[PDB]
């Protein structure tokens, strides 16, 4: 069952990264799980666009000859992959204010640490870097050489969190 | 160190050699080795005032000594 | 499985060229994947219009004796495709303003060049016919025998975009 | 000769072609074989207004004929 007929996935190009991974994610996915032979989904991919992206596919199909290369192409018209030091400034740019809890600061913070080059950076500089922009109350209490991964600092954030 | 260290962005008079010095004084002080030239020149380029941005880009840097040198001749030049 | 029974794709009549273009092209390619006939997408067509479309189709059923008679009455009752001279006005409008990347403007402009009758404009006057309706800022750059197709300009165009 | 270069630095009107054909031919009463080009396009490199100066610099131009094409270049706009 690989006609690519019936999905309810879809994409218009709102110009951000997070919801081209998404959907790309998604298609990936999909095809892994119900199986198609790696040739009938470029024949059945102009059944998933919508609005300005099918203007876009009737202008640039005749460039795609393979299911990697169209991939390629939707990442690469749709994301322009932002160099080193916008992410750095960006990162240091916001503080954690207060009626926020740990999960979703640190959940931003580890999808902005992703878009760099592979390789530079392994886990404890990256600790290191994102322990300064935390709030007071919980750096009253969780001080350094205690915590060596970030599961552990999650999980005493969220005792420190619900304890009181 | 990491926090010192984006806190106050150049100012509108300092010349650029002032800057690049007491920015290098301050990053020495990490442990040795976890940071080669390239990955500091890319750390250090984020706080330049306008007055050099606009002009000198990050495609050709290759490095400290021409940065200063490149400021150098666009400083002399009276902005 | 092609009895036309289970497909989200409609149509409502908002005389406009894209939608129309859109939903022939979704219909057409949903035959080519799933499997017709050839004739039982004629017994089944009824099943996709809503509104102002179905009382359009009750009146005109008994004048649709294949499919591509069908499919051009649709094209040539909703859209009565456009003479030469309105497309070049149309074209040379509108310039392009501050807060507007290049992919929106070039999908557009291409968009709109294909209503011409085909064999007349090469690839080469064609983009000196649109290279003169661009803003001072990617132009002071970009400047010309140095690009010969719409992929090498774009890609210029994206790399002094995310540069400064 | 000496003196009557380095007067009258080049002003906001006057295109780049006017004045480098005058500045030239001015420079050929010297005695002959004084000068290599090199040191005659460092001399020329003085007088310039700010307006050309600040995108070409020394580095860059080699020969006696690119600044006219990067003049030229720079000053279609």
Not at chain 1, 2 to 25: L, P, Q
Not at chain 1, 133 to 159: A, C, P, W
Not at chain 2, 53 to 75: A, P
Request: with cysteine; hydrophobic share 35%.
């Amino acid at each position: 069952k690989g006609n690519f007929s019936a999905c309810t996935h879809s994409f218009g190009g709102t110009r951000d990264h997070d919801v081209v991974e998404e959907f790309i994610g998604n298609i990936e996915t999909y095809k892994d799980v119900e199986g198609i032979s790696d040739e009938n989904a470029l024949k059945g991919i102009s059944l998933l666009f919508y609005g300005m992206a099918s203007t876009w596919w009737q202008g640039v199909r005749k460039e795609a000859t393979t299911w990697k290369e169209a991939i390629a192409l939707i990442r690469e018209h749709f994301s322009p992959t932002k160099p080193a030091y916008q992410i750095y400034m960006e990162f240091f740019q916001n503080k954690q204010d207060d009626h926020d809890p740990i999960d979703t600061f640190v959940i931003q913070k580890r999808a902005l640490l992703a878009q760099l080059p592979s390789g530079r950076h392994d886990e404890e500089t990256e600790l290191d870097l994102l322990f300064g922009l935390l709030n007071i109350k919980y750096r009253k209490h969780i001080s350094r050489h205690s915590v060596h991964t970030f599961k552990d600092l999650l999980e005493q954030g969220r005792i420190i969190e619900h304890n009181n | 160190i990491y926090m010192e260290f984006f806190q106050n962005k150049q100012d509108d008079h300092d010349p650029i050699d002032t800057f690049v010095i007491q920015k290098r004084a301050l990053l020495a002080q990490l442990p040795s080795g976890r940071h080669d030239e390239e990955t500091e020149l890319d750390l250090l380029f984020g706080l330049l005032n306008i007055k050099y941005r606009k002009h000198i880009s990050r495609h050709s840097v290759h490095t400290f000594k021409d940065l200063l040198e490149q400021g150098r001749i666009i400083e002399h030049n009276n902005q």
